């Protein structure tokens, strides 16, 4: 089957400087700036657009050794990025993969909006456990803070 | 006038790994295994393809501050790599830009050369100093020899 599920998290970080940091580089700042959580991202083919694969790896202690994802679009204009799960990881067994697309809204106050959604594809009606949904968001939270704390640190990065 | 001086540069590490690591993922190598030589590298527009700008920023004590780059072509079949520089560092007064093209060979023996093309666009008859031209080829071997440093350190990354 097919199962989705949406999420939306708060930035104070306003669209264009987030996108460029959290999306665009996130391959440079996440090892530097989450070390707890990315320990490196390595190119596996592609230059940086769609069809581009990249293999993530973790530090030890985490559930996964790493994972590889594939870019699947990336959307300058709507600020929109979309790339699938392929391997490792939770891919295994019952899971063939994860797509996922996050877009990036501009808010009145000057911050922004990070509308995420992760569909699964799962064998039959095998379904995904909710631990698996929460280690999701919770990375993606993680990341998105530690990005957010380097910016509101260096002033004059990505502007 | 348009000067083009060209240089040759030998790695014990075969294409397909070198392509990978010190032309497609240079931007996140360089700050970590060179930290003398490069400070940050800050994506300014595109996702990596033809047109991408890429501002670089120098520890200080170097001469420059930054440059921008502009990638304008990633030929991955050929291991072809094209940029030009265009804002910062020499660029001023009487240089324009300066357009380079790096291909990497594989030899014989495992290993691969580098062959590199650095072009200076200067204003009518003016010329560039030697220094210029010998603090490029000098910064491009700091850079290589220091990601060649890490493959062997690691020997499981990028492949």
Do not use: C, W
């Given at each position: ?107 009145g ?25 929460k280690?999701?968001?919770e ?21």
């Amino acid at each position: 089957g097919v199962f989705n599920y949406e999420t939306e998290t708060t930035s104070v970080i306003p669209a264009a400087r987030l996108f460029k940091a959290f999306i665009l580089d996130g391959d440079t700042l996440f090892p530097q700036v989450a070390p707890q959580a990315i320990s490196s991202v390595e190119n596996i083919s592609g230059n940086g657009g769609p069809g581009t694969i990249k293999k993530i790896s973790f530090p030890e202690g985490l559930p996964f050794k790493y994972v590889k994802d594939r870019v699947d679009e990336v959307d300058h204009t709507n600020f929109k990025y979309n790339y699938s799960v392929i391997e490792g990881g939770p891919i295994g067994d019952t899971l063939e993969k994860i797509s996922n697309e996050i877009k990036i809204v501009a808010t009145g106050d000057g911050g922004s909006i990070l509308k995420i959604s992760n569909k699964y594809h799962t064998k039959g009606d095998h379904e995904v456990k909710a631990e698996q949904v929460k280690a999701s968001k919770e990375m993606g939270e993680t990341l998105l803070r530690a990005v957010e704390s380097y910016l509101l640190a260096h002033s004059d990065a990505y502007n």
